[PDB]
Symmetry: C2
């Protein structure tokens, strides 16, 4: 169990914040971001473009770090790892250490860290200004395990924290977004957005039940009711 890093959005002096491509939701999309959920949906090991915006250029030596943590409070102290199956497969590509869930693509100056005090994984790269005629710098990531990987994330949602820091590692800025690695990003984005939509217009509701046995009674009853809805229509 490890201490939990802060996820507080912080633009800092240089006005640091993330930007994402506006994509559709066709079942064939390999990667799609949901603004309404601040959640990125992507397929296994598929490229994820992330835009870095600043209002003023940071000093030389500035760096950008990516780290993942579990979103659920009860699993926050558990380091996010790849499942054993994917991690120990004999056919690793060697492009990055095999234990890292998050990789940076297209950057040979990328450094992978395994913190000596928290044992948390992160990948870091030198901050680079936008290309001429552009106001953002692009970073491409790849996630090496599905959200449902047993022995890994095991269907637990994760948050990706991006921090802007100086050469020493001091904080300059921070932002984050949720991530779900799945087979069909398009339909999953639509499903989760619909779930949010139905919750806001009073179609879906949630209830907190005390005690595991009590909760189970309520869940079983709710199932019978939905089975009855299915049968009714």
């Amino acid at each position: 169990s490890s201490s939990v890093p802060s996820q507080k959005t912080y633009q800092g002096s240089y006005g640091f914040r993330l930007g994402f491509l506006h994509s559709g939701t066709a079942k064939s999309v390999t990667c799609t971001y949901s603004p309404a959920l601040n959640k990125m949906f992507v397929q296994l090991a598929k490229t994820v473009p992330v835009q870095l915006y600043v209002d003023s250029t940071p000093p030389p030596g500035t760096r950008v770090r990516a780290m993942a943590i579990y979103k659920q409070s009860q699993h926050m102290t558990e380091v996010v790892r790849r499942c054993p199956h994917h991690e120990r497969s004999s056919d690793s590509d060697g492009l990055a250490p095999p234990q890292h869930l998050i990789r940076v693509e297209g950057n040979l100056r990328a450094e992978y860290l395994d913190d000596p005090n928290t044992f948390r994984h992160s990948v870091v790269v030198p901050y680079e200004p936008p290309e001429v005629g552009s106001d953002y710098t692009t970073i491409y990531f790849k996630f090496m395990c599905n959200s449902s990987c047993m022995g890994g994330m095991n269907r637990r949602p994760i948050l990706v924290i991006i921090t802007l820091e100086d050469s020493s590692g001091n904080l300059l800025g921070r932002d984050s977004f949720e991530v779900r690695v799945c087979a069909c990003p398009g339909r999953d984005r639509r499903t989760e957005e619909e779930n949010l939509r139905k919750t806001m217009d009073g179609e879906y509701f949630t209830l907190q039940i005390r005690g595991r046995e009590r909760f189970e009674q309520f869940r079983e009853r709710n199932e019978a009711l939905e089975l009855k809805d299915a049968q009714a229509g």
Copy 2:
């Protein structure tokens, strides 16, 4: 409907914060504060002592203001008022304007305000340093309506906000505490603390429900079960 004032705790430059007497919970107590709930329990129009602490002395002209707002999100924009029955009774004492729920006792420099832009009520007094041989200044309040007053708070919980300000009304500090005016503060404090006790000790699970009425039904069942939890013991 009126804008909602901030309830953000803020000690400011002078280290401003509230202090309260430690009291018992016998059914005969007229006023008793719950540290665990940051909630004051008091009988109708009974004196409520509140201690003002600062680490450094505020400049001359500094003032202390008390204002109440409803705690529940859905009722926050509704101005907190006394019920009509208590407000329009012919036998008003004239010690303070009759519409004010909150009064300051024992201070002839107390000023009652009916905001011209928000129509919210508040009482303000000049800030005074602690008596020699003391590190806090005491302010005494009186609440002129029961929490259950129909046509008034109507059983809706209220939050009292105390703000330290300069002579011009600029913010210097802020703190707050919940309040419940009832017949038996002692038993109610114990009852509410016990309810909190059961909530902290319990493990909760989330049930996703479809259908407004289906939800209302489960909710009723759940609250009925928690009701029996508080009865058995």
